[PDB]
Amino acid sequence: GPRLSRLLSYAGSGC
Amino acid sequence: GSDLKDAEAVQKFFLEEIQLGEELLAQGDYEKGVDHLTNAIAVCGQPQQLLQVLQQTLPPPVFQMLLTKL
Structure with a gap:
């Protein structure tokens, strides 16, 4: 970490 | 500082839960699969976009059960 x-997945989620 | 650590831990958990859940759905375990996806949604501050994505990628009855779990 x-x-x-x-980082990408979290940004892609819009969360 | 501690803010970075907080965010790091959440981002790791988020992706790990989605990936465990995805794998369980591939293995035909929808029950445990959806349980992990609901752990990822739980840590999601603003989950509406995530829910719309899940609704596109899941059979509707499964999306529907997921909603009933939260």
Whole structure:
């Protein structure tokens, strides 16, 4: 952490 | 600082739960699969966009059960 895939997925979620 | 750590932990959990859940749905375990997706939704501050995405990717009766769980 941080990892790109977590950052991207979270940004993609709109959460 | 601690704000970064807070956000890191949430982002890890979020993706891990969605990926566990996705795998359980592939294995035909919809029950446990949806349980993990609802853990990801729980930590989601503003989940409406997430719910619209799930509604596009899930059979409607499953989306419907997911809603009943929250």
